Amino acid sequence: MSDIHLEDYTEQYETGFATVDTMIFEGGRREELLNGGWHYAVDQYDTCLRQKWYKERYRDEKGFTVPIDYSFDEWPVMQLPCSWNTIDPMYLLYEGSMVFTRKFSYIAEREETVFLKVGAANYLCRVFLNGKYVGMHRGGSTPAFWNITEYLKAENRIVLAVDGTRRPEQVPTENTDWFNYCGVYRDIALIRVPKCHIKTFKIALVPDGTFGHVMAKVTLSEKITAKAELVIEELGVSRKIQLENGAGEVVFDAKPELWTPEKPKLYDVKVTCGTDTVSDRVGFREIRVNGRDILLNGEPVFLRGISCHEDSVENGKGLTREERIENIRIAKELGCNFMRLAHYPHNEEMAKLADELGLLLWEEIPVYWAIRFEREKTYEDAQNQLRELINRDWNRASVIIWSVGNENADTDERLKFMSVLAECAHREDETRMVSAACLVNAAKNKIEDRLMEYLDIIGINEYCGWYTPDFAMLPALMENSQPDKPVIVTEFGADALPHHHGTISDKGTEECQADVYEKQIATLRNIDYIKGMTPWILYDFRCPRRTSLIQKYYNRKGLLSEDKKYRKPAFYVLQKFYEELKRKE
Amino acid sequence: MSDIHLEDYTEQYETGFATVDTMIFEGGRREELLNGGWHYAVDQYDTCLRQKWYKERYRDEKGFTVPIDYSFDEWPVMQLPCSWNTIDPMYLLYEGSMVFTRKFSYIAEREETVFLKVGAANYLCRVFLNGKYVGMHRGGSTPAFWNITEYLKAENRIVLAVDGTRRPEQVPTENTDWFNYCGVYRDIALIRVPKCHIKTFKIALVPDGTFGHVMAKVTLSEKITAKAELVIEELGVSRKIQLENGAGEVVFDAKPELWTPEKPKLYDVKVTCGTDTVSDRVGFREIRVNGRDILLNGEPVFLRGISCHEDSVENGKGLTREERIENIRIAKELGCNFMRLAHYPHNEEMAKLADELGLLLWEEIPVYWAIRFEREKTYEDAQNQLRELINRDWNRASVIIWSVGNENADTDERLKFMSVLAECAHREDETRMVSAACLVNAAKNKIEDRLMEYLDIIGINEYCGWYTPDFAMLPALMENSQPDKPVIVTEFGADALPHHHGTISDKGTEECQADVYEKQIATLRNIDYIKGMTPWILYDFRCPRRTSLIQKYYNRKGLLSEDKKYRKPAFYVLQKFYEELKRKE
Amino acid sequence: MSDIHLEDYTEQYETGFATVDTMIFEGGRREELLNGGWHYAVDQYDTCLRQKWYKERYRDEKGFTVPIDYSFDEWPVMQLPCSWNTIDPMYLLYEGSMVFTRKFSYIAEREETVFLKVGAANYLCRVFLNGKYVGMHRGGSTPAFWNITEYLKAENRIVLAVDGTRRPEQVPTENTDWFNYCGVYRDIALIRVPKCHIKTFKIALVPDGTFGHVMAKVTLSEKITAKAELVIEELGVSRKIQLENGAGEVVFDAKPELWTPEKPKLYDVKVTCGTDTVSDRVGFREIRVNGRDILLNGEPVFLRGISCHEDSVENGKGLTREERIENIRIAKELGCNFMRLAHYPHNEEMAKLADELGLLLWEEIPVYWAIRFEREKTYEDAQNQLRELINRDWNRASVIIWSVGNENADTDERLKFMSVLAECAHREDETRMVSAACLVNAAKNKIEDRLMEYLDIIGINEYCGWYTPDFAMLPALMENSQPDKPVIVTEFGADALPHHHGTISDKGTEECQADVYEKQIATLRNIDYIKGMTPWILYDFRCPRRTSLIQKYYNRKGLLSEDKKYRKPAFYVLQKFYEELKRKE
Ligand code: NI
Ligand code: NI
Ligand code: NI
């Protein structure tokens, strides 16, 4: 009677992990999706994992039918991918488990390996194929890959069990300032590849100040002596890459036009190896820090930014391509050259669109507030998510900063945890800057945090005029501080319910929010070491912490309403500043 | 930064407990309810307990307003008491926290102590009054009492934070076979009493075989020497009780008509002590076991029973008086003299109506499936709920059996935990029988479980013809067993979706369910040691484990549909059996 | 290309008919229903019958999948039995085909024959089992039986294709004055019987004027020599019946209390033959005609009647038991001893409830208006429906009159068709009277119709004061006529929209309807040869011919509104008349 008497029914599924080490490079690969209607059940008590519905035991050993608690083909249907919270109002506040199943046929036209990719599933995803357990993924915003070659038949049943439960030891914890959207909400794909295939492919301008050297790195699925053929036709590049034990790299001379948000030049690149082919569309640029300067392609820059969550009234966390394009267009209308994508990895199409339309990006993992920094398995979770993100987005010129977390306490255990993450980012990616968003040192009203020593760029969150209501605290904060690194003010802002007006002293009104922006900008614009800002936030987003009548379960710090149809007065305050900077160059 | 960086934000509230030791006797006490509209928020991340909204800190020390995430008087309103899951479809699957608040005025007309009673709140209830923490209750089906005398002002604000979260270490665990209804779902009351008041009052027929002696026990809120006076005018009784250190008892002669379900005679009793008065309405009966016989008032009985959950389509767990009367009336129409109230304490009005209308009762605590038997604090939770139940219902003649749990594994840790619970019940109540529902010993197909040694009556659950599909296992089971004490078959049955028909071999149909009842009765009715049965169950109830098309998130073992408007064929099978037994006397 | 180029795709299904000759007697037989949720499609073009979906050809001979236009297990679900028109507003006016399918398991515990019964399906029902065609039924209001023994497997799929299409050559034609309710709307059953089983059982009081002799006739499924034994324990009866070639009968002495509506005495009767047993619950009464007198148990009666359709706002033609009880109770409150069930066989439970509650009945087949009297296959359809009705209801004491049709033209072809139907009824049932509802002879304003010669009782429809607006035509009609047999006025009345008032000259108002009843009763009550009346009608019913603002697609001649919650003034006019007759005895 283990289905009712087994206390630790999940331990048996802690195997077959999808991790950064099972990802494959997808550029240029044809994929068949499993998007569509899946039969589903709400599984509030995790009954599928206790009773093992995926085994489909309908009769006992003696031929008697047994009672069952599921009916796969007669279950209702839900269109995947989606955040299930926005499918039906009954599911808005549901954060337990749902079980999804469908069938598909499989015929190999040649010898091939097949991966299942789940583009994102929050928070846990357990995979079953033809009655057998494939494995699981932990972490709610990164793609998960499993080699399913050995499970496939001519006709298949796949089951996905997805648990939205919040837990203090997860990354993030159970307490955040955003909405817990659950389910399988980015594309589900089948990827056929040769037995010997390209597993990783990384390419970048070498950040040596000459703008004339390009590095490319390849690893294969097998330890083999081989070569790859790299082609960049527009740059006249055709170079051999020699592979030893399935890995190799090359550095070669080239003269690309350097990518900027204003001139987002991209190049088609193609790599062959054995019978395999991949391709990408990549820009070349150098991002460095020199003293207090942020240098893009050798030139100091001011990052005119805005923060942005992955939220949608209709789609929850599963934004469409159109919604991503809208966010970039509105940010550029606002005058931005930079966007802070908070607080987790967004859909990879965001950085691809930023590559194409021209917008610098900061990408982040949800090491947020009271992470269990002492727990080794929590470190393993965080480091895997960091490395998944870096591996997924390595070739995105638009991305210039990896952030290892946000608003964590300055304790010994936090410093060990997050400094090692910062070292991990640097080791995984020699081309990009590493940052994090820190709280103000309240005792000294000072930019001072032990983590900052390990960062290329300091992010500081401050809410003077709001959570720190006395505006005079802001000039004092900047006078008290003299960092030797560039500073991005990674958050400031104020709530305003759309169309809620009052005096500038009425916190929560449009007038007060615009007044906060006026005072913030008047101080920050003349601090020499502040080299950017990403005010919180582009538009209102669902938020379980905000319950007042002038919040209505949305964080109201957006410069636009939650459907992005309406611009609040503070939008035009920030825009006027950014357009001034643009006019000055 | 405590509200965002404190990991263990709940430890500070582990104080001011409501327990069996803070209960007061309520019979004959005037109460003022706080039922009504309460302003409320969905508090998914427990923000109220982290930010301490109940302190209502609206300005800082320098007079600046600070942003806040709540608005008590402008929140929407929910009528309490209720299960919040049936209030709106958005809350059906919500099992986090909600925060409720309202105001009330208080004027003492004489010196008095005041208790707050929360009739039931699942699972945790934290109480705040005028910005101060009063305390909390743990356990989802028993009434909670706090002395609030020292918190009261002329105008008051009360805040209740109620957490529906399921946890493995709770009682029950996170895995049950019933629906997790959450909220404050029985009466909220203010109770004014003298400073020295009657704290407990227990009265029962002495089970000495004469039916002519009555015991009465009183304790006071103060450890003093005093006399109480007990009056039963209809029986010519007036007796003093000498109290010492706040406690005393007396045994006296009386000639009551003995309570039975067929003739449920009740008597008004009144007790005074100092300036305090309490009263009750009680029946007098003797319940004993002799060998394999269950004896009511000296005569062997067969308990023609049905099991029953506290479930309602419209009201969730917060059944109305009319719904309880309906359940009793339908049970009696079915031919029952007995009902198993599963698996937790029902509203105390159930046993009061059973006293009045005439139905014998089994009441139970949710020590169900995989309880953390090794954890001392889990034992403390279970023991407290057991003692709350017994103290609440001590004077209910209809209740004859306390059950200490259901379908637990026969392990050493379980045995230590549940045998000590059974000893607790025996020590707390010398007048009633103790039982539990046990699984069949699958190794021997036998009624054999180490806990049975500690019980007066053996409860056995068996599902031959259903989960044990071979009917032949049932005669084998009864042949293999020769218990020395009475056996109640506390569960058997089969799913049937209302109006879903098929052949008797189609599991899940009405015809198969009726066939299972026919074969169960044919065997059970001729087993000498089976003195009762409570088939599972009177009517269909919400059940998160049952997801098939012929279940629809209801357990379908009811003899009636979930609205009790429709009787399935198996209803008449059982009814015919019970009416034969009644015909025979 | 058969599914697209075959013009006559239905001819292949004109086989395996369910007819009166395949019916079996059901009294006392255990049945397993197939009522429940069936997966279904709207099949507007009869694609299932052209493409043969029931063969489930999913792959071609080379193993390729082929496209299909159905998905049995993933279709939506409809609860059967029902009139599909009242299931959803989208189906109210749908009268094409629908396809229903489900599965069921079958295990024979002994050698047995199995019948499928479809209690009623309007108009055509085609049956498929495990991919094979079983057969079909024609006729929308009678039960259909097919021997499916040789089709059954351990796991079965049944498909029912049901066509509601109206056709001029059907019985009824495409033009009626009632609503075309479609679908399988009475119980679907599986019936297990011995190979040699009792096929028909008929029992009645011998109409020889002694009231002391009972006849009983039995036929078997096999043409063998055997004895049956008949028992009526309450009357001290036990008699053998000698069967030869599968058939025999017996007449025996018995002293039953004679059934009347006021004292509806019934008796349990049981018949055994070999291993088979059937039983029934029957009353004993004599119905005869002598001159102009209708004699019940030897006494002249006046039939205080009302007409009644099988109509329900919520359920369409699939009335519940409660709705039938309501119709009988309201008729008796109106003062009726008699009801005309128009214009087709109602659920057989109607006459069983009339047996029990006490109401005399007229039952009728829908040979209505412009039947294709010249077409032999239309005659075959009508004769079969008549014989199905008579075989179904032979043992119902409440039924005293079989009606062979309604308001047909007095032509030579009609006379040949309907007189042979009347001879059929007489030959099939020696115990009951035969009638029909005839139009007034408009040339003579006279009761005169060539079919009346073949009837025991004359039914005349007349609408003086309504369709014949001059009331003076009614006394003229009765003056012009001097029939030699009893006359029942089988229809009169007037529209009244509930709560629609006006002057007595406003046709369509309550006042005018009451005025018509006053004048009808004033004349009819003093005509010597009028021995009964069944005014049209008890309550408003759906009617596609009535489109005015004061009709709203209902026939408004009811004495009550369509939900039977409201009694119009004419209700009390008729009630006052019937209670005067009852007062007089
Ligand atoms: Ni406005
Ligand atoms: Ni039914
Ligand atoms: Ni009126």
Residues bordering ligand 1, an ion, CB closer than 5 Å: A 499
CA distance B545 to chain C (A): 21
> Which residues of chain C neighbour B497 with C-beta distances below 8 Å?
36
Long-range pairs of A205-209 with CB within 8 A, sequence gap ≥ 24: A205/A256, A205/A258, A205/A284, A205/A285, A205/A286, A205/A431, A206/A251, A207/A286, A207/A287, A207/A288, A207/A430, A207/A431, A209/A286, A209/A288, A209/A298
Question: Which are the contacts of A425, defined by CB distance < 8 A and separation ≥ 6?
Answer: A386, A390, A402, A404, A432, A434
Cα gap C50→C11, rounded to integer Å: 11
- φ/ψ of B403, rounded to 5, equals -110, 130
Length of chain B measured in residues: 585
Facing A5 at nearest CB: one of B89, B174, B369 = B369
Residue B295's SS3 state is: strand
- Joined together, the tokens standing for residue C307 give 């007409």
Q: How far is the CA of A499 from the centre of ligand 1 (A)?
A: 5
C contact residues 79-98, partner B, Cβ 8 Å cutoff: 79
Q: How far is CA A306 from CA A333, A443, A519, B571, C379, in A?
A: 12, 28, 17, 66, 85
Inter-chain contact B175–A4, Cβ cutoff 8 Å?
yes
Facing A93 at nearest CB: one of B74, B93, B407 = B93
Closest residue on chain B to A468 (Cα): B66
Task: Give which of B319, B305, B345 is closest to B143, Cα–Cα.
Answer: B345
Residue with tokens 């004077």: B395
CA angle C68, C69, C75 (to 5 degrees): 115
Residue A517's SS3 state is: helix
Cα gap B365→B388, rounded to integer Å: 10
Task: Give which of A211, A381, A384, A191 is closest to A288, Cα–Cα.
Answer: A211
Inter-chain contact B497–C105, Cβ cutoff 8 Å?
no
Question: Which are the contacts of A240, defined by CB distance < 8 A and separation ≥ 6?
Answer: A227, A228, A229, A230, A250
Exposure of B569 by Cβ count < 10 A (0-12 exposed, 13-18 middle, 19+ buried)? middle
Structural element, H or E, at residue A569: helix A569-583
- Joined together, the tokens standing for residue B88 give 């709106």
Cα gap B289→B483, rounded to integer Å: 13
CA angle C247, C253, C259 (to 5 degrees): 95
- Joined together, the tokens standing for residue C177 give 């004055």
* CA pseudo-torsion sign A241, A244, A247, A249: negative
Residues B432 and B294: beta-carbon distance below 8 Å: no
Inter-chain contact B549–C105, Cβ cutoff 8 Å?
no
Q: C329: how many CB neighbours lie within 10 A of its CB?
A: 14
CA distance B490 to chain A (A): 18
CA angle A495, A497, A502 (to 5 degrees): 90
Tell me the HSE value of C212 on the side-chain side, using a 13 A CA sphere: 2
Closest residue on chain C to B502 (Cα): C34
Task: Give which of A216, A180, A184, A181 is closest to A200, Cα–Cα.
Answer: A216
Residue A168's SS3 state is: coil
Cα gap A355→A260, rounded to integer Å: 9
Residues B437 and B430: beta-carbon distance below 8 Å: no
Q: Following CA atoms A87, A88, A93, A95 in sequence, which dihedral angle do they give, to the nearest 10 degrees?
A: -50
DSSP C444: T
Q: Bridge-partner residues for A271, per DSSP?
A: A230, A278
- Joined together, the tokens standing for residue A376 give 């080794």
3-state secondary structure C555-583: ECCCCECCCCCCECHHHHHHHHHHHHHHH
- Single-letter amino acid, residue B284: F
Q: B239: how many CB neighbours lie within 10 A of its CB?
A: 16
Inter-chain contact B71–A41, Cβ cutoff 8 Å?
no
Is the peptide bond preceding residue A366 cis, with omega within 30 degrees of 0? no
Residue with tokens 């299904």: C13
Task: Give which of A378, A495, A386, A367 is closest to A438, Cα–Cα.
Answer: A367
Inter-chain contact B502–C106, Cβ cutoff 8 Å?
no
A65–chain B Cβ distance below 8 A for any pair: yes
DSSP B21: G
- Single-letter amino acid, residue C251: V
3-state secondary structure C76-96: CEEEECCCHHHCCHHHCCCCC
Longest Cα–Cα distance in chain C: 84
Interface contacts (B, C; CB < 8 Å): 37
Interface contacts (A, B; CB < 8 Å): 150
Closest residue on chain A to C107 (Cα): A64
- Joined together, the tokens standing for residue A263 give 């001139």
Tell me the ligand closest to A569's alpha carbon.
1
DSSP C259: P
Cα gap C192→A87, rounded to integer Å: 48
Task: Give which of C434, C442, C529, C535 is closest to C481, Cα–Cα.
Answer: C529
> Which residues of chain B neighbour C77 with C-beta distances below 8 Å?
549
C35–chain B Cβ distance below 8 A for any pair: yes
Residues A491 and A463: beta-carbon distance below 8 Å: yes
Cα gap B406→A540, rounded to integer Å: 49
Task: Give which of C68, C55, C44, C73 is closest to C133, Cα–Cα.
Answer: C55
Cα gap C384→C378, rounded to integer Å: 10
> Which residues of chain C neighbour B503 with C-beta distances below 8 Å?
32, 104-107, 190
Cα gap A515→A501, rounded to integer Å: 12
A386: Cα separation from own chain's centroid: 9
* CA pseudo-torsion sign A386, A391, A397, A398: negative
> Which residues of chain C neighbour A105 with C-beta distances below 8 Å?
65
- Joined together, the tokens standing for residue C273 give 């033959």
Residues B327 and B310: beta-carbon distance below 8 Å: no
Task: Give which of A268, A233, A238 is closest to A252, Cα–Cα.
Answer: A238
B74–chain A Cβ distance below 8 A for any pair: yes
- φ/ψ of A82, rounded to 5, equals -165, 155
Q: How far is the CA of B42 from the centre of ligand 1 (A)?
A: 29
Residues C157 and C129: beta-carbon distance below 8 Å: yes
Tell me the ligand closest to A496's alpha carbon.
1
Residue A328's SS3 state is: helix
Tell me the ligand closest to C497's alpha carbon.
3
- Joined together, the tokens standing for residue A348 give 């990879």
End-to-end CA distance of chain A: 72
Tell me the ligand closest to A566's alpha carbon.
1
> Which residues of chain C neighbour A73 with C-beta distances below 8 Å?
73-74
Cα gap A226→B384, rounded to integer Å: 71
Resolution (A): 2.0
Residues C23 and C119: beta-carbon distance below 8 Å: no
Q: B496: how many CB neighbours lie within 10 A of its CB?
A: 28
Structural element, H or E, at residue C385: helix C376-393
Cα gap B51→B73, rounded to integer Å: 18
Exposure of C502 by Cβ count < 10 A (0-12 exposed, 13-18 middle, 19+ buried)? middle
For chain A, breaks with the C atom over 2.5 A from the next N come after: none
Q: How far is CA C478 from CA B95, C409, C516, in A?
A: 78, 21, 17
Cα gap A40→A98, rounded to integer Å: 7
Quickly list DSSP for C278-335: EEEEE----EEEETTEEEETTEE--EEEEEE----TTTTT---HHHHHHHHHHHHHTT
Question: Which are the contacts of B322, defined by CB distance < 8 A and separation ≥ 6?
Answer: none
Longest Cα–Cα distance in chain B: 84
Question: Which are the contacts of C110, defined by CB distance < 8 A and separation ≥ 6?
Answer: none
CA distance B503 to chain C (A): 5
C contact residues 188-227, partner B, Cβ 8 Å cutoff: 190
Q: Is A557 left (phi over 0), alpha (psi -120 to 50) or beta?
A: alpha
Q: How far is CA B449 from CA B49, B446, B460, B476, B483, in A?
A: 44, 9, 10, 17, 11
Q: Following CA atoms C349, C351, C352, C353 in sequence, which dihedral angle do they give, to the nearest 10 degrees?
A: 90
Inter-chain contact C32–B511, Cβ cutoff 8 Å?
yes
CA distance A107 to chain C (A): 12
Cα gap A153→A107, rounded to integer Å: 8
Structure-determination technique: X-ray
- Joined together, the tokens standing for residue B514 give 């009726």
Q: How far is CA C391 from CA A420, B26, C200, C283, C428, in A?
A: 90, 69, 8, 17, 8
Cα gap B104→B32, rounded to integer Å: 11
Residue C151's SS3 state is: helix
Cα gap C238→C231, rounded to integer Å: 4
- C32-33 β-sheet, strand order: C32-33, C188-193, C113-118, C144-147
Task: Give which of A424, A428, A458 is closest to A440, Cα–Cα.
Answer: A458
Inter-chain contact B467–A46, Cβ cutoff 8 Å?
no
Is the peptide bond preceding residue B537 cis, with omega within 30 degrees of 0? yes
Structural element, H or E, at residue A333: helix A321-333
- C247-253 β-sheet, strand order: C198-205, C213-220, C247-253
C92: Cα separation from own chain's centroid: 22
Inter-chain contact C104–B549, Cβ cutoff 8 Å?
no
Question: Which are the contacts of B360, defined by CB distance < 8 A and separation ≥ 6?
Answer: B261, B296, B303, B337, B338, B339, B354, B398, B400
Q: How far is the CA of B569 from the centre of ligand 2 (A)?
A: 10
Angle between helices C412-428 and C376-393 (to 10 degrees): 30
CA distance C275 to chain A (A): 29
- Joined together, the tokens standing for residue A50 give 């206790």
Cα gap B305→B335, rounded to integer Å: 8
C74–chain A Cβ distance below 8 A for any pair: yes
Tell me the ligand closest to C511's alpha carbon.
3
DSSP C52: T
Question: Which are the contacts of B137, defined by CB distance < 8 A and separation ≥ 6?
Answer: B17, B18, B118, B121, B124, B125, B144
Cα gap A265→A285, rounded to integer Å: 10
End-to-end CA distance of chain C: 72
Cα gap A331→C560, rounded to integer Å: 69
Cα gap A303→C292, rounded to integer Å: 109
A105–chain C Cβ distance below 8 A for any pair: yes
Ordered structural domains, chain C, with CATH? 2-193 (2.60.120.260), 198-287 (2.60.40.10), 288-584 (3.20.20.80)
Q: Bridge-partner residues for A298, per DSSP?
A: none
Q: Following CA atoms A49, A52, A55, A58 in sequence, which dihedral angle do they give, to the nearest 10 degrees?
A: -140
> Which residues of chain A neighbour C105 with C-beta distances below 8 Å?
65
B548–chain C Cβ distance below 8 A for any pair: no
Cα gap C553→C544, rounded to integer Å: 5
Tell me the ligand closest to B566's alpha carbon.
2
Residues A488 and A455: beta-carbon distance below 8 Å: no
Closest residue on chain C to B498 (Cα): C36
Question: Which are the contacts of B209, defined by CB distance < 8 A and separation ≥ 6?
Answer: B286, B298
DSSP A7: S
C112–chain B Cβ distance below 8 A for any pair: no
Inter-chain contact B90–A94, Cβ cutoff 8 Å?
no
Tell me the HSE value of B527 on the side-chain side, using a 13 A CA sphere: 25
Q: B114: how many CB neighbours lie within 10 A of its CB?
A: 18
Is the peptide bond preceding residue B197 cis, with omega within 30 degrees of 0? no
Quickly list DSSP for B182-242: -EE-S-EEEEEE-SS-EEEEEEEE--SSSS-EEEEEEEESS---EEEEEEEGGGTEEEEEE
